[PDB]
Amino acid sequence: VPGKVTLQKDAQNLIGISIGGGAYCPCLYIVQVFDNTPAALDGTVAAGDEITGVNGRSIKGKTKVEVAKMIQEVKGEVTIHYNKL
Amino acid sequence: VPGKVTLQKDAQNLIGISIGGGAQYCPCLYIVQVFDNTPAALDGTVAAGDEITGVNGRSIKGKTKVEVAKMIQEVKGEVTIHYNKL
Ligand SMILES: CC(C)(C)OC(=O)N1CCC[C@H]1C(=O)N1CCC(C(=O)N[C@@H](C(=O)O)C2CCCC2)(c2ccc(Br)cc2)CC1
Ligand SMILES: CC(C)(C)OC(=O)N1CCC[C@H]1C(=O)N1CCC(C(=O)N[C@H](C(=O)O)C2CCCC2)(c2ccc(Br)cc2)CC1
Known part of the structure; x- marks a missing residue:
């Protein structure tokens, strides 16, 4: 289901996620x-x-x-737009 | 980088993983x-x-x-699992 969330950046400028996909594998997780x-x-x-x-x-x-x-x-x-698992 | 592992099922016939993907517009499974x-x-x-x-x-x-x-x-x-390492 689509949602969005605004995340504060930590002092290291991170929100604290890794990502994969975005390749013949076009979706990003x-x-x-x-x-x-x-x-x-x-x-x-x-x-x-x-x-x-x-x-x-x-x-x-x-x-x-x-x-x-x-x-x-x-x-x-930052605001991350997502579709929940 | 491709791979394969053979994993023994437990007592509940599980190898202990949850999967992602394989929808339309998102074919890849993870x-x-x-x-x-x-x-x-x-x-x-x-x-x-x-x-x-x-x-x-x-x-x-x-x-x-x-x-x-x-x-x-x-x-x-x-079960043998054929995968690509992230
Ligand atoms: C979901 C929750 C929160 C209840 O998890 C757990 O607390 N535990 C505790 C022990 C492990 C896990 C569990 O109960 N499950 C059972 C359901 C599960 C499964 O059937 N089996 C996989 C397996 O590990 O062989 C297969 C089939 C799909 C990919 C490989 C699954 C996941 C995604 C789909 Br789609 C269908 C089934 C994950 C392990
Ligand atoms: C990587 C390991 C295992 C060493 O990390 C850690 O134990 N720590 C502990 C705390 C967090 C994580 C961190 O250090 N990393 C830093 C590098 C990281 C990042 O920059 N994320 C960003 C962020 O969180 O905002 C963006 C970039 C991708 C989407 C989010 C990253 C992830 C994917 C890509 Br591609 C490039 C960089 C992951 C978080």
Whole structure:
């Protein structure tokens, strides 16, 4: 089911997730949510979750590195658009 | 980087994993979670976010999660998992 969540960036400029996909494998997922990060303490997102945009912008046909870039550049807080596992 | 592991089922016929993917527009299947104290976990080969390409020498191409899940359920004893390492 589609949702979205705004995550604060930690002092290390992280929300605390890894990602995979974004390849003949075009969908993009959260693979890990790291303990003690803003994404782990929020509780909204989880492994399995499909990522679909990043501050109102789609990630369609972006590489995993491209989406990592996208996310890191957004400072303070970021809004991850998802479809729940 | 491709691989395959043969995992012994436990007492509940489980290897201890949860899968992702295989919808329309999202064909690829993945391991979403490895659950502690299961065969998959204690073997240590596969992990969250590895791609499942094959079970027991046949492809999972163009199957849904449910179908894959019953492909794995219905092999007793042990099951070989063909994957791509994340
Ligand atoms: C979901 C929850 C939270 C109840 O998990 C657990 O607390 N535990 C505790 C012990 C392990 C796990 C469990 O009960 N399950 C059972 C259901 C499960 C499964 O059937 N089996 C897999 C297997 O490990 O062989 C197969 C089939 C799909 C991929 C491989 C599953 C997952 C996704 C789908 Br689609 C269908 C079944 C996961 C392990
Ligand atoms: C990687 C390991 C296993 C060493 O980490 C850790 O134990 N720690 C503990 C705390 C978190 C995690 C962390 O250090 N990392 C840093 C690197 C990381 C990242 O930069 N994530 C970003 C973020 O969380 O905002 C973006 C980029 C991709 C989507 C989110 C990453 C992930 C995927 C890609 Br591609 C590139 C970088 C993961 C979180």
